[PDB]
Structure formats: structure tokens, C-alpha cells
Amino acid sequence: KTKQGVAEAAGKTKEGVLYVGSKTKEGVVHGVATVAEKTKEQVTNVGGAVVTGVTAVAQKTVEGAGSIAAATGFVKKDQ
Amino acid sequence: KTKQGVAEAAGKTKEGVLYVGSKTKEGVVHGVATVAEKTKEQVTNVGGAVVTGVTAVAQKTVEGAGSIAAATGFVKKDQ
Amino acid sequence: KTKQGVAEAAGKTKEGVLYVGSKTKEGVVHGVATVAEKTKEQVTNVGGAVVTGVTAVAQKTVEGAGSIAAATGFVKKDQ
Amino acid sequence: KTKQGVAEAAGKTKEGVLYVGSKTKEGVVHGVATVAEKTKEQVTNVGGAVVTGVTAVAQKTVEGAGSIAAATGFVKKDQ
Amino acid sequence: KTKQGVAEAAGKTKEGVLYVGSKTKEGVVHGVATVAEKTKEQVTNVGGAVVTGVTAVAQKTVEGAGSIAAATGFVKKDQ
Amino acid sequence: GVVAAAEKTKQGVAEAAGKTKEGVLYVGSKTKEGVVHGVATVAEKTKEQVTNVGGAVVTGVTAVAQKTVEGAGSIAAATGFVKKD
Amino acid sequence: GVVAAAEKTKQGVAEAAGKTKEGVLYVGSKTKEGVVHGVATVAEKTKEQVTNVGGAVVTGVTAVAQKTVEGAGSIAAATGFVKKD
Amino acid sequence: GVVAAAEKTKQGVAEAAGKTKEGVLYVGSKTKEGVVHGVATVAEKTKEQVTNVGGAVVTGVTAVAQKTVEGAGSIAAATGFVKKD
Amino acid sequence: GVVAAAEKTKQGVAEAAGKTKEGVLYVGSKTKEGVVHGVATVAEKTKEQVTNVGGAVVTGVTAVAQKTVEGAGSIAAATGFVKKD
Amino acid sequence: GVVAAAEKTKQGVAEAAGKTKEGVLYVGSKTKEGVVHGVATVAEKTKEQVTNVGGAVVTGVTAVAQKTVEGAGSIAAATGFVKKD
Numbered sequence A, B, C, D, E: 001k002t003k004q005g006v007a008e009a010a011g012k013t014k015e016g017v018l019y020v021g022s023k024t025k026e027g028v029v030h031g032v033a034t035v036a037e038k039t040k041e042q043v044t045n046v047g048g049a050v051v052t053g054v055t056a057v058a059q060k061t062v063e064g065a066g067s068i069a070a071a072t073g074f075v076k077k078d079q
Numbered sequence F, G, H, I, J: 001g002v003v004a005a006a007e008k009t010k011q012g013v014a015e016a017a018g019k020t021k022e023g024v025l026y027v028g029s030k031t032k033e034g035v036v037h038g039v040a041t042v043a044e045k046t047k048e049q050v051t052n053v054g055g056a057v058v059t060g061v062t063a064v065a066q067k068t069v070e071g072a073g074s075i076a077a078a079t080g081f082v083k084k085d
């Protein structure tokens, strides 16, 4: 018996109005806003990596070892 | 017996109005907004990687090792 | 016996109005908005990768190792 | 028997209005806002990594060793 | 029997209005705001790593040893 | 006078506008004007008497949602001698 | 005067507009004007009497959703002598 | 006079605008104007009497949501001799 | 006079604007104007009597949400002799 | 006079603006104007009598949320002889 990340709700009544609710959020990206106004961007790239935009990554994994959620704007030359 | 990421709701009544609800969110990307107004972008690329737009990635995996959710704007020259 | 990512709801009554509901979201991309107004973009590419648009990827996998959800704007020259 | 990250709520009444709710947030990125107005950016890159945009990463993993959530703007040349 | 990071709420009444709620936040990034106005940035990079944008990373892991949540703007040349 | 020109190029765009007026636009947005949501009423034994003589009476469980642009929204109006010249 | 020109190019676009006025546009949007959602009523033993003499009475469980552009929305209106000249 | 020019380039954009006026825009936004949400009422034994003579009465459990642009929103209005010249 | 020029380049942008006026914009925002949220009422044995003669009475459990732009929002108004010239 | 120039470059941007006026903008913001939140009322045995003669009475459990732009918000107004010339 083991509980992990469990939302539990219980209610009891006889007469009237009863409301029961449960919510669970795991690995959730919520509410990302970006505004660019009159922005000047000049990029010169020679064999590299340049990142300018908006990146939103949400990952949920079970029994996963060595997982990478996001890898943005990198140069890898492993031998 | 094992519980993981479980939303549970229970309700009981005799007379009236009863509401029971349960929600679960795993690896969810919600609410991404981007606005660009009068933006100037000049890009010169020679053999590289340039990223300017909007990227939204949501991944849910079970029993997956070494998984990568997002890999944006990279140069890889492994030997 | 094992529960993972399970939404459960139960309700009981005798007289009146009863509502029971359950929702589950796994690997879901929701609500992506992008607006570009009077935007100038000049791109010169020679053998590279340039990404400017909007990308929304949602992936759900079971028993999958090494899976990649999104790989946007990259140059790969592995030997 | 073991409880970890569990939200529990219980309520009881006879007559009236009763509200029961439970919420759980694990590895959640919420409320990221970015505004750039009249911003000038000039980037010259030769074999490197340059990151300018907005990155929001949320990762939840169970039984995962060595996992990396985000790796942004790096140069790796391991031998 | 072991409790860790558990939010518990209980209420009882006979007549009237009763409210019971429980919330849990683990590894949550909330409320990040950034504004740049009339900002001039000139970057020249030769084989290095330069980071200028906004990064928000939230990671929750169970039974994970050696995990790294964020690694931003680094040069690694391990032998 | 508004003049835009582009000469001796490979890719060229020349746009000139005298007067411009933008409008309203909605992208991925939700709106709620005059919305009644989630009303629950429980009554066991209610004794009610109404005696109306030339009036406006609104009685019982009432849920009204209204949205008017160039008009008035009323629930109970007992008036008289309404004229427009 | 508005002039736009493009000469000696390979790909060229020249657009000139004197006066421009944008309009309204909806993209992936939801709207709710005058909406009644989720009304639940439970009554066991209700005794009700109504005596109406020249009036407007709204009685019982009532759910009204209205949307008017160039008119008035009313639920109960007991008026008299309405004239327009 | 507004002049924009671009000569002897490979990629060139020349835009000139005399007068410009931006508008309203919504991107991923939610709006709530005149919204009634989450009303719960429990009554066991209510004795109620109403005697109305030429008036406006609003009685019982009432949930009203209104949104007017160029009009007035009223719940109970007992007036008389309304004229417009 | 407003002049913008760009000559002898590889990538060039030239924009000139005489007069500019920005507008309102919402990005990932929530708004609540005239919102009633979370009202709970419990009554066991209420005895209530109303005697109305040419007036406006608002009675019982009432939840009103209003939003007006160019109009007035009233709940109970007992007036007389309203004229506009 | 406003002049912006850029010559003999590889990447060049030249922007000139005579008069500029920014506007309002919301990014990831929440607003609450005229909001009633979390009202709970419990009554056991209430005896109430109302005698109204040409007046405005607001009675009982009342929750009112109002938002007006170019109008007045009133709850109970017993006036007379309202004229506009």
C-alpha cells in the first residue's frame, strides 16, 4: 500500500447542496504570455545555434531514467 | 496495491443537489500566447540552426527510459 | 493491483439532482495563440535550418523507450 | 503504508451547503509573462550557442535517476 | 506508516455552510514577470555560451539520484 | 505625401499607406456577457400567496440572463403613461 | 498622394492604399451573450396561490435568456397608455 | 511628407505610413461582464405573503445577470409619467 | 518631414511613420466586471409579509450582477414624472 | 524633421517616427472590478414585515455587483420629478 500524488475528497449530507471535487496537476505548463513590440533583432550564425522564440515543454514520465525534458539551443560535438 | 496520480471524489446525500467531479492533468501544456507587433528580424545562417517561432510540446510516457520531450535549435556532429 | 493516472468519481442520492463526471488529460496541448502584425522577416539560409512558424506537438506513449516528441530546427551530421 | 504528496479533504453536515475540494500541483510552471518594447539585439555567433527567448519547462518523473529537466544554451565537446 | 508532504483538512457541522479545502504545491514555479524597454544588447560569441532570455524550470522527482533540474549557459569539455 | 520606393534589389517590397485604422480582433479568447452559471435551490415546504392589482411581480426561483445593445433590460417594471414625441 | 514603386528587382511587390479601415475578426474564439447554464431546483411540497387583476406575474421555476440588439428585454411589465408620436 | 527608401540591397523592405491608429486585440484572454456564478439556496419552511397594488415586486430566489451597452438595467422600477420630447 | 533610408546593404529595412497611435491589447489576461461568485444561503423558518402600494420592493435571496456602458444600473427605483426635453 | 539613415552595412534597419503615442496593454494580468465573492448567510427564525408606500425598499439577503462606465449605480432610490433640458 502506497499513495503518491493522490487528491482525495469525500463529503456527506442529508438535505441541501453538496459539492465534491478533486484536481491533480503533474508536469503541467500553464499561462505563458510573451509580447514583443517594435523589437529589432539581427542574427548572424556560422555553424552555431541561436534561439529567439518561446519554448514551453511539459513532460511526465513513469519509470524513466535519464530522460531529458528540454534541450534548447546547444552545440554538441562529442567524440 | 499502489496509487499514483489518482484523483478520487465521493459524495452522498438524501435530498437536494449533489455534484461530484474529478480531473487529472499529466504532461499538459495549457495557455500559451504570443504577440509580435512591428518586429524586425534579419537572420543570416550558414550551416547552423536558428529558431524564432513558438514551440509547445507536451509528452507523457510510461515505462520509457531516455525519452526526450523537446530538442529545439541544436547542431549535433557526434563522432 | 496498481492505479496510475485514474480519475474516479462516485455519487449517491435518493431524491433530487445528482451530477457525476470524470475527466483525464494525458499529453494534451491546449490553447496556443499567436499573432503577428506588421512584422518584417528576412532570412538567408545556406545549408542550415531556420524555423519561424508555430509548432504544437502532443505525444502519449506506453512502454516506449527513447521516444522523442519534438525535434525542431536542427542540423545533424553524425558520423 | 506510505503517503507522499497527498491532499485529503473530508466534510460532513446534515442541512445546508457543504463544499469539499482537493488540489495537487507537482512539477507545474504557472504564470510566466515577458514583454519586450523597442529592444535592439545584435548577435554574432561562430560555433557557439546563444539563447535570447523565453523557456518554460515542467517535468515530473517517478523512479527516474539522472534525469535532466532543462539544458539551455550550452556547448558540449566531451571526449 | 509514514506521512510526507500531506495536506489534510476535516470539518463537521449540523446546520449552516461548511467549506473544506486542501492544496499541495511541490516543485512549482509561479509568477515570473520580466519587462525590457529600450534595451540595447550586442553579443559576439566565438565557441562559447551566452544566455540572455528568461528561463523557468520546475522539476519534481521521486526516487531519483543525481538529477539536475536546470543547467543554463555552460561550456563542458570533460576528458 | 507618402512615398515608398525600393530599387536595385533581388527581393523588394514597397508599401505606402496614407491613413490606416485598425479594428478589433479576438484570437483564442473566451467572452461571457450576461451569463448565469451554477444555480441550485432546494425548498421543502414553502407557503406563498400573491395578490397583484395592476403591478409587476416576479415570483419563485428565477434565473434571468440578459444582454442588450441599444435597449433597456428590466425584470419588474410597473409604470404608466409612457410617451415619446 | 500615395506612391509605391519597385524597379530593377527579381521579385517585387508594390502596394499603395489611400485610406484603410480594418474590421472585426474572430479566430478560435468562444462567445456567450445571455446564457443560462446549470440550473437545478428541487421542491417537495409547495403551496402557491396567485390572484392577478390586470397585472404581469412571473411564477414558478423560470429560466430566461435574452439577447436584444435594438429592443428592450423585460420579464414582467404591467404598464398602460404607451404611445409614440 | 513621409518617405522611406531602400536601394542597392539584396533583400529590402520599404514601408511608409502617414497616419496610423491601432485597435483593440485579445489573445488567449478571458472576459466576464455581468456573470452570476455559484449560487446555492436552501429553505425549509418559508411563509411569505405579497400584496401588490400598482408597484414592482421582486420575490423569492432571484439570480439576474445583465449587460447593457446603450441602455439601463433595472430590477424593480415602479415609476409613472415617463415622456421624451 | 520624416525620412528613413537604407542604401548599399545586404538586408535592409526602412520604415517611416508620420503619426502613430497604439491601442489596447490583452495577452493571456482575465477580466471580471460585475461578477457575483459563491453565494450560499440557508433559511429554516422565515415569516415574511410585504405590502406594496406604488413602490419598488426587492425581496428574498437576490443575487444581481450588472455591467452597463452608457446606462444606469438600479435595483429598486420608485420615482415619478421623468421627462427629457 | 526626423531623419534616420544606414549606409554601407550588411544588416541595416532604419526607422523614423514623427509622433508616437503608446496604448494600454495587459500581459498575464487579472482584473476584478465590482466583484462579490464568498457570501454565506444562515438564518433560523426571522420574522419580517414591510409596509411600502411610494418608496424603494431592498429587503433580505442581497448581493449586488455593479460596473458602470457612463452611468450611475444605485441600490434603492426613491426620487421624484427628474427632468433634463
Ligand SMILES: Cc1cccc(C)c1NC(=O)Cn1nc(Cc2ccccc2)c2ccccc2c1=O
Residues within 6 Å of the ligand: F070, F071, F072, F073, F074, F077, F079, F082, F083, F084, G070, G071, G072, G073, G074, G077, G079, G082, G083, G084, H071, H082
Ligand atoms: C423595458 C421597459 C419596460 C417597461 C417600461 C420601460 C420604460 C422600459 N424601458 C424601455 O422601454 C427603454 N426603451 N425606450 C424606448 C423609447 C420608447 C419607449 C416606449 C414607447 C415609445 C418609445 C425604445 C425605443 C426603441 C427601441 C428601444 C427602446 C427602449 O428600450
Ligand SMILES: Cc1cccc(C)c1NC(=O)Cn1nc(Cc2ccccc2)c2ccccc2c1=O
Residues within 6 Å of the ligand: F071, F082, G070, G071, G072, G073, G074, G077, G079, G082, G083, G084
Ligand atoms: C418590452 C416592453 C414591454 C412592455 C412595455 C414596454 C415599454 C416595453 N418596452 C419596449 O417596448 C421598448 N421598445 N419601444 C419601442 C417604441 C414603441 C413602443 C410601443 C408602441 C409604439 C412605439 C420600439 C419600437 C420599435 C422596435 C422596438 C421597440 C422597443 O423595443
Ligand SMILES: Cc1cccc(C)c1NC(=O)Cn1nc(Cc2ccccc2)c2ccccc2c1=O
Residues within 6 Å of the ligand: F070, F071, F072, F073, F074, F077, F079, F082, F083, F084, H070, H071, H072, H073, H074, H077, H079, H082, H083, H084, I071, I082
Ligand atoms: C429600464 C427602465 C424601467 C422603468 C423605468 C425606466 C426609466 C427605465 N429606464 C430606461 O428606460 C432608460 N432608457 N430611457 C430611454 C428614453 C425613453 C424612455 C422611455 C420612453 C421614451 C424614451 C431609452 C431610449 C432608447 C433606448 C433605450 C432607452 C433606455 O434604456
Ligand SMILES: Cc1cccc(C)c1NC(=O)Cn1nc(Cc2ccccc2)c2ccccc2c1=O
Residues within 6 Å of the ligand: H070, H071, H072, H073, H074, H077, H079, H082, H083, H084, I070, I071, I072, I073, I074, I077, I079, I082, I083, I084, J071, J082
Ligand atoms: C434605470 C432607472 C430606473 C428608474 C428611474 C431612473 C431615472 C433610472 N435611470 C435611468 O433611466 C438612466 N437613463 N436615463 C436616460 C434619459 C431618459 C430616461 C427616461 C426617459 C427619457 C430619457 C437614458 C436615455 C437613453 C439611454 C439610457 C438612458 C438611461 O440609462
Ligand SMILES: Cc1cccc(C)c1NC(=O)Cn1nc(Cc2ccccc2)c2ccccc2c1=O
Residues within 6 Å of the ligand: I070, I071, I072, I073, I074, I077, I079, I082, I083, I084, J070, J071, J072, J073, J074, J077, J079, J082, J083, J084
Ligand atoms: C440610477 C438612478 C435611479 C433613480 C434616480 C436617479 C437620479 C438615478 N441616477 C441616474 O439616472 C443617472 N443618470 N442620469 C441621466 C440623465 C437623465 C436621467 C433621467 C431622465 C433624463 C435624463 C442619464 C442619461 C443618459 C444615460 C445615463 C444617465 C444616468 O445614468
